[PDB]
């Protein structure tokens, strides 16, 4: 009996009354439209935006911390080399804006040097993320933005084959170029190659080298695309699992262990992967919200008053929209709770408070690599956690409106069976 039931749960009485009133239903639909714009159209104030930004910053920060300590070297087929120095520019090396891969004789692979092939995948992804962070991520609903990325690397030493036409695609080591494209959007890559002799005016360094430039045009900068690069970054590090060896300054923060393999940061890498996975799921809710627009007013038909049992076929759509928005908000929250140091403990807390959520540069803009980036995050992780919380706090009214609307729709989906 329903009177018995509503005397105990008078909010349900109110809900049923709202569900039978086109004017309250339309008010709830309007709210969903305004909460959707807050989530997928805004930047500062969107918890979904702040969480996507946090997932990417954490991946990028992870490398800024440990990249300088990571061994890499060898030749082009993942094989050991005799005297190959391959240097990747705009990377957070030890007191340097390059990382130098010059470990010879050891076979690349697990608990050994990262292969140059793996460093190339990692570096390309790092360059795209840093360029994008520097320009600013767009709001989630923006899928056709692009960025231009340029990066360089050099090969020197007898027998170094990582800069060779055969590997690079190019025709001639000195002067050649190559254009190639790939994919739902076309990205065009322009590779060009140059040789600098040891005995050539302007060559500070002792030695002959080849310089490779890659210019990528039309790289997409949407959340999905960038989350895919972050995942490529973190998964290449974890799968390749190279040897690292750290330098601890006396005084500041101490890294244990001091030597080992990068996979060995199992808590850290798991967390980042989870953040990225949750942020992918979160961004996917955007197509659900887009598919089920709520801007069309609803009401009775051919003269009659609204009938909640027959006129409510829009409810399924309203329920899916509302639930997707709630899911975005919950996943955003979850992303923050994965990395927030207030709830971490031991090794992992120390890694975040001491290293990841720290910058040693002289707020320099996002995406900047200096000679002091190394052993620190420099990806705005503290600021981004704070802003995620600020935006959740500023989403109080909208969250209650999303719940009201989910409940109204759910009441109509039940009445409609």
């Amino acid at each position: 009996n329903l009177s018995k039931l509503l005397t105990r749960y008078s909010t349900l009485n109110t809900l049923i009354k709202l569900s039978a009133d086109p004017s309250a239903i339309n008010a709830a639909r309007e709210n969903l439209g305004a909460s959707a714009k807050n989530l997928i159209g805004d930047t500062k104030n969107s918890p979904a935006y702040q969480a996507v930004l946090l997932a990417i910053n954490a991946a990028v920060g992870f490398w800024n911390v440990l990249g300088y300590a990571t061994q890499c070297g060898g030749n082009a087929n993942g094989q050991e080399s005799t005297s190959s120095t391959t240097i990747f520019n705009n990377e957070p090396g030890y007191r340097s804006t390059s990382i130098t891969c010059s470990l010879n004789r050891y076979k690349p692979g697990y608990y050994g040097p990262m292969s140059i092939e793996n460093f190339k995948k990692l570096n390309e992804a790092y360059q795209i993320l840093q360029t994008a962070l520097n320009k600013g991520l767009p709001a989630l609903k923006e899928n056709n933005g692009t960025v231009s990325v340029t990066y360089t690397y050099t090969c020197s030493g007898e027998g170094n084959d990582n800069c060779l036409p055969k590997v690079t695609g190019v025709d001639n080591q000195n002067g050649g170029t190559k254009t190639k494209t790939q994919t739902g959007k076309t990205v065009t890559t322009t590779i060009s190659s140059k040789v600098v002799d040891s005995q050539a005016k302007g060559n500070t360094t002792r030695v002959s080298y080849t310089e490779i430039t890659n210019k990528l045009d039309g790289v997409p900068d949407s959340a999905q695309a960038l989350l895919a690069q972050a995942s490529t970054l973190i998964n290449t590090i974890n799968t390749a699992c190279p040897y690292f060896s750290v330098t601890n300054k006396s005084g500041g923060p101490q890294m244990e262990p001091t030597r080992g393999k990068l996979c060995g940061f199992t808590e850290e890498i798991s967390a980042i992967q989870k953040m990225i996975t949750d942020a992918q799921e979160l961004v996917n809710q955007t197509s659900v919200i887009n598919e089920h627009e709520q801007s069309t007013p609803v009401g009775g038909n051919n003269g009659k008053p609204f009938n909640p049992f027959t006129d409510a076929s829009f409810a399924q759509g309203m329920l899916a929209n509302a639930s997707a928005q709630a899911k975005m908000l919950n996943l955003a929250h979850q992303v923050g709770q994965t990395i927030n140091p207030d709830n971490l403990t031991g090794t992992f807390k120390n890694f975040v408070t001491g290293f990841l959520a720290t910058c040693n540069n002289k707020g320099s803009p996002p995406g900047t690599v200096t000679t002091q980036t190394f052993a620190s995050g420099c990806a705005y992780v503290e600021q981004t956690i704070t802003n995620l919380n600020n935006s959740i706090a500023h989403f109080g009214t909208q969250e209650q409106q999303i719940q009201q609307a989910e409940n109204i729709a759910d009441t109509l989906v039940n009445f409609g069976s």
Partner: nanobody
Amino acid sequence: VQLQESGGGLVQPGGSLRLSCAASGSIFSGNVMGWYRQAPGKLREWVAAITPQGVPNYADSVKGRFTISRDNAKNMLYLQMSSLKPEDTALYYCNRLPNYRSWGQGTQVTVSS
């Protein structure tokens, strides 16, 4: 995973009340927390919120008159209500934002001459 409000009662208009919430650590720690209320014939309404670092924000209906605060050492959340009007009459509830799906029992506030 638990929430427990207290401090409500019947007061006169112009009056003042301090509400408390005892939350569990898993709810409270590192989370934005806030207060809500549910007035007669209406659905639950968001009232105030506060970040882990202590920055508060308020709904227009209470801004200037209520103050939200948190004690991070005891997982307590507080709401100081001043200049009460009959329209502040409601069951008040606390939660984290976004909300844990099981609410506490609430505390009744009635303002009336």
